[PDB]
Design a protein around this ligand. Structure first.
Ligand SMILES: CC(C)=CCC/C(C)=C/CC/C(C)=C/Cc1cc(C(=O)O)cc(O)c1O
Ligand SMILES: [Cl-]
Ligand SMILES: [Cl-]
Ligand SMILES: [Cl-]
Ligand code: NA
Ligand code: NA
Length: 352
């Protein structure tokens, strides 16, 4: 054990926590992502996710920040369903609501009236195939005011999503109901593929974690195949290479590192985690952030199969007329990515 590397993990985590606490807005929200001149900037979703990521820290001042985040989420009580959404002006969605319920658990509020109401609302998003859909059709059509989408199918946006199903399965009340859907959606290579995310490491880590938390021996082969996939994804240099980041995605690497925590016996897995930690420590910026790489994609509303859509472009790189559909946006504040990385390092440190 190299005590310098453990001490650098302390210093790295601390610098990231400082960045994240200072990055909150006037009311105290974490904000990230932007749909310019339209849905604008995420707050409820980003705050629920960042708060959940930070729940792994033992620090009293971090717990205080999470208690404040929950108070802010409870003030967002304007939707008749009790759900949360991307930000104030969006309708409710199952993904935001699921992350908000994970944050509620971290602050002892799983049994609160609001949490009970929001969990009940999640049940409306369950699909006949046993997964969770992000949106109710009536709610998201009401929000969207784009003429050429008026009479189009929303069955893509309102279908079962593996990414959101995996996140909701982190909630004990839903884990058993979503089990079979998560099992049957695993690919032949051992990974899962998500709807709103480019990086399969996110959906794969969350799904394997939900199967692990259920404790069923029947699920351990699936978990092990996912870990084997993660080991393949991680380069010897310590990063997951992507088309966009061929020398390593900080977001994909952090999620892969979380996936690899699910096997604590295999020496190759242990060495891969050590490599990923070293690379992440080297990539940290002086302000304690990591480079933004949380790539959120917007399929057409009618598209059930975004992993079969070869036309993705980065919204911020498109010249001239552009639309959100078929484009990828990112966490311009680096809050989403940094929270992800810092969580992965806190969880992985003790397994060095
Ligand atoms: C927490 C979740 C589920 C994140 C996934 C991304 C997501 C769907 C954000 C919600 C905001 C939204 C509808 C962005 C797309 C859009 C907006 C408009 C508009 O605001 O006018 C128009 C579009 O055509 C469009 O695709
Ligand atoms: Cl209550
Ligand atoms: Cl790169
Ligand atoms: Cl797909
Ligand atoms: Na309440
Ligand atoms: Na509409």
């Amino acid at each position: 054990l190299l005590y310098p590397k453990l001490n650098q993990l302390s210093n790295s985590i601390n610098a990231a926590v400082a960045f994240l606490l200072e990055a909150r807005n006037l009311e105290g929200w974490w904000q990230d992502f932007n749909f310019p001149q339209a849905a604008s900037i995420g707050d409820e979703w980003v705050t629920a996710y960042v708060g959940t990521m930070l729940a792994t820290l033992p620090y009293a001042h971090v717990h205080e920040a999470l208690m404040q985040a929950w108070e802010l989420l409870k003030i967002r009580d304007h939707r008749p369903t009790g759900e949360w959404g991307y930000n104030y002006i969006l309708c409710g969605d199952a993904d935001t609501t699921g992350w908000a319920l994970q944050l509620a658990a971290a602050v002892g509020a799983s049994d609160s009236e609001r949490a009970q109401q929001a969990r009940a609302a999640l049940a409306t998003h369950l699909q006949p195939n046993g997964g969770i859909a992000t949106f109710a059709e009536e709610s998201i059509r009401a929000y969207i005011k784009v003429p050429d989408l008026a009479n189009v199918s929303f069955q893509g946006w309102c279908g079962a999503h593996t990414c959101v199903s995996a996140a909701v399965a982190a909630l004990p009340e839903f884990r058993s109901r979503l089990h079979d859907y998560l099992r049957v959606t695993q690919t032949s290579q051992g990974n899962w593929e998500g709807y709103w995310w480019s990086d399969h490491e996110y959906t794969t880590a969350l799904t394997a974690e939900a199967l692990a938390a259920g404790g069923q021996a029947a699920d351990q082969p699936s978990i092990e195949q996912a870990v084997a996939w993660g080991l393949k994804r991680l380069c010897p240099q310590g990063f997951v290479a992507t088309s966009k980041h061929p020398n390593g995605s900080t977001f994909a690497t952090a999620w892969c590192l979380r996936l690899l925590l699910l096997n604590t016996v295999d020496a190759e897995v242990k060495a891969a985690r050590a490599a990923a930690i070293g690379w992440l420590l080297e990539q940290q910026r002086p302000n304690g952030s990591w480079v933004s790489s949380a790539y959120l994609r917007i399929p057409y509303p009618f598209d059930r199969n975004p992993n079969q859509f070869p036309h993705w472009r980065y919204y911020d790189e498109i010249e001239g007329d552009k639309r959100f559909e078929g484009s990828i946006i990112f966490d311009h504040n680096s809050i989403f990515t940094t929270a992800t990385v810092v969580n992965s390092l806190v969880k992985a440190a003790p397994m060095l």
